[PDB]
Amino acid sequence: ERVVIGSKPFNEQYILANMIAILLEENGYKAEVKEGLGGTLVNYEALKRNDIQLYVEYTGTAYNVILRKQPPELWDQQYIFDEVKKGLLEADGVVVAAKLGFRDDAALAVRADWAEENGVEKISDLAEFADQLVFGSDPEFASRPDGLPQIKKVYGFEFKEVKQMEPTLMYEAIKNKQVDVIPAYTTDSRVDLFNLKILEDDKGALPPYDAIIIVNGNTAKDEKLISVLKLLEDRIDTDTMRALNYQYDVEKKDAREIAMSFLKEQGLVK
Incomplete structure (x- = not known):
């Protein structure tokens, strides 16, 4: 079927949304990217409505903006990850499909x-x-x-x-x-x-702010699609994401071509 992918209006999101799109198309899906659809809540509500099927969110952002939870005395990475996973699932049936491997x-x-x-x-x-x-x-x-x-x-x-x-x-x-x-x-x-x-x-x-691919409840039940998203699990560390952003910001390269080059280098497309 067709998979629609959301994004927020900035470099990293344009690159990552296109990356997921290309990877899915490589694995038999038809994919559409909504580049700069809107901010956090525009994307999250679109996800709940099934107007989009997935997008890249950040743990701290989900914790604060989406779930509106109370700050801990000290911020721990996995505590926040687990609280977000439980919280999104219980509230909305939204599933964390993958941790990309970097924090922003x-x-x-x-x-x-x-x-x-x-x-x-x-x-x-x-x-x-x-x-x-x-x-x-x-x-x-x-x-x-x-x-x-x-x-x-x-x-x-x-x-x-x-x-x-x-x-x-x-x-x-x-x-x-x-x-x-x-x-x-x-x-x-x-x-x-x-x-x-x-x-x-x-x-x-x-x-x-661990970068995570979140998917709506219905899309999460597609075992093949989840498997494809899991190919991005721990794929991109903070150094790597920053250098991808460098290609966009400094070198003025197209976001989709940045994503394409990465996937090809990683051997996930071709």
């Missing part, structure tokens, strides 16, 4: 050369350096329920100073060494373009 998290980033020289890889590594470092911030990060005050509480440090600025000036500020630490999304191509290092939230101050 709000995180902290620093310059990569400095991180290398000092062996900084996690937020807890910043402890001894914190009171010497300048933190760059925007309205988007400051408005978050989990932010700098939660980082202080969990990690036990505060930065030298906080410089507020427009979100479009953040990477320039860290590149020009006006600030030393910025909020950045883990799969954002600019992390690589500005030679930054993303840090592990090793203590769980911030929410996890």
